[PDB]
Amino acid sequence: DDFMFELSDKPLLPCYNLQVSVSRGPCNWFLFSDVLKRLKLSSRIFQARFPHFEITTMPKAEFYRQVASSQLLTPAERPGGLDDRSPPGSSETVELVRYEPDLLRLLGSEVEFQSCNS
């Protein structure tokens, strides 16, 4: 429909196609730590100044499981695999922030829309 293009002079942060709960369809996310590192801002600063961006958490093992099901990502590109279980009696998690145009701009990318018929 209204296709969004992210453009930059430099390599883009990788994004991951995830369903973060059974009650919602898949969409794209960055690892929050990738975003903070790129912006050189802390979580506290980020969440205070940009509260509209969606931050969510996911079990690290579930993150791996869904990422491993991606057909586009090569094994080398995947953060972790099916053999990377969390140790017993733990709850390792990852923080994710939803992929959306205002965040792309903040990251320094140009955003362009194209809706001429396909």
Binding site: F3, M4, F5, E6, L7, S8, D9, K10, P11, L12, P14, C15, N17, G25, P26, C27, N28, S70, Q71, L72, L73, T74, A76, E77, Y99, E100, P101, E110, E112, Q114, C116, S118
Partner: protein, 81 residues
């Protein structure tokens, strides 16, 4: 929305090149985006893979399947003129 899988591309000039878009986007969409940035008419820029012109209606997914299956990101494409 931008909710399907996204592909990362790197556009190299054939005599802002890192681009991300939906697997559903087509060559003609990407070309129109490029023309806007280059301030040119659509007829003037071509999108190519390995120096061969791409069909306008081919999706990024179709390019990836047929040219880039299992290869590392980003998908390498060319644009000309």
């Amino acid at each position: 929305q931008g909710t399907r899988e996204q592909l990362n591309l790197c556009l190299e000039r054939l005599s802002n090149k890192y681009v991300r878009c939906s697997v559903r986007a087509e060559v003609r969409h990407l070309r129109r985006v490029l023309c806007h940035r280059l301030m040119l008419n659509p007829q003037h820029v071509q999108l190519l893979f390995d120096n061969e012109v791409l069909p306008d209606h081919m999706t990024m997914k179709q390019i990836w399947l047929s040219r880039w299956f299992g290869k590392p990101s980003p998908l390498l494409l060319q644009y000309s003129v």
